[PDB]
Structure 1
Amino acid sequence: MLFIICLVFISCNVLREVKYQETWCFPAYGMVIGLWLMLSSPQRRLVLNHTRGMYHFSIQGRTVCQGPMHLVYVRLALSSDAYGGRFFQLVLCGHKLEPLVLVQLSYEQMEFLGRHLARKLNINYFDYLASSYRHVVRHWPLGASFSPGIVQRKTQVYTKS
Structure 2
Amino acid sequence: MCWVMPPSVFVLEYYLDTLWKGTMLFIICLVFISCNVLREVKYQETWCFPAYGMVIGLWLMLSSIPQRRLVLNHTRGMYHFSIQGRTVCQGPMHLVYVRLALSSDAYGGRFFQLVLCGHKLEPLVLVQLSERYEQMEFLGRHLARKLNINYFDYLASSYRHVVRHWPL
TM-score by length of 2: 0.44
Instruction: Give runs of aligned pairs for residues 71-150 of structure 1, distance below 5 A.
Output: 74-92=98-116, 95-106=119-130, 115-127=141-153
Q: Give, in whole Å, the separation in 2 of the partners of 1:53 and 1:19.
A: 64
Q: Does the aligned pair in 2 maintain the 1:89–1:102 contact within 8 Å? A: yes
Q: Does the aligned pair in 1 maintain the 2:101–2:112 contact within 8 Å? A: yes
Q: Does the aligned pair in 1 maintain the 2:97–2:118 contact within 8 Å? A: no
Q: Does the aligned pair in 2 maintain the 1:76–1:88 contact within 8 Å? A: yes
TM-score by length of 1: 0.45
1:56 partnered with 2:96: no
What secondary structure is seen at the aligned counterpart in 2 of 1:87?
strand
Q: Give, in whole Å, the separation in 2 of the partners of 1:76 and 1:91.
A: 7
What secondary structure is seen at the aligned counterpart in 2 of 1:12?
coil
Indicate how the Cα distance of structure 1 residues 36 and 81 shifts in structure 2: closer, same or farther if over 3 A, else same.
Answer: same
Indicate how the Cα distance of structure 1 residues 33 and 2 shifts in structure 2: closer, same or farther if over 3 A, else same.
Answer: closer
**Structure 1 vs Structure 2 CA RMSD:** 7.0
Q: Does the aligned pair in 2 maintain the 1:4–1:39 contact within 8 Å? A: no
Q: Does the aligned pair in 1 maintain the 2:148–2:164 contact within 8 Å? A: no
Q: Does the aligned pair in 2 maintain the 1:94–1:139 contact within 8 Å? A: no
Shift of 1:56: 0.9
Q: Does the aligned pair in 2 maintain the 1:53–1:69 contact within 8 Å? A: no
CA displacement, residues 78-100 of structure 1 (integer Å, 9 cap, x when unaligned): 23333312122434455442221
Paired residue total: 142
| Percent identity over paired residues | 100
- Runs of 5+ unmatched residues, structure 2: 1-23
Q: Which has the higher helix share?
A: 1
Shift of 1:74: 3.3
Shift of 1:22: 12
Q: Give, in whole Å, the separation in 1 of the partners of 2:100 and 2:34.
A: 35
Shift of 1:63: 1.0
Q: Does the aligned pair in 2 maintain the 1:12–1:29 contact within 8 Å? A: no
Indicate how the Cα distance of structure 1 residues 123 and 22 shifts in structure 2: closer, same or farther if over 3 A, else same.
Answer: closer
Indicate how the Cα distance of structure 1 residues 61 and 111 shifts in structure 2: closer, same or farther if over 3 A, else same.
Answer: farther
Q: Does the aligned pair in 2 maintain the 1:12–1:30 contact within 8 Å? A: no
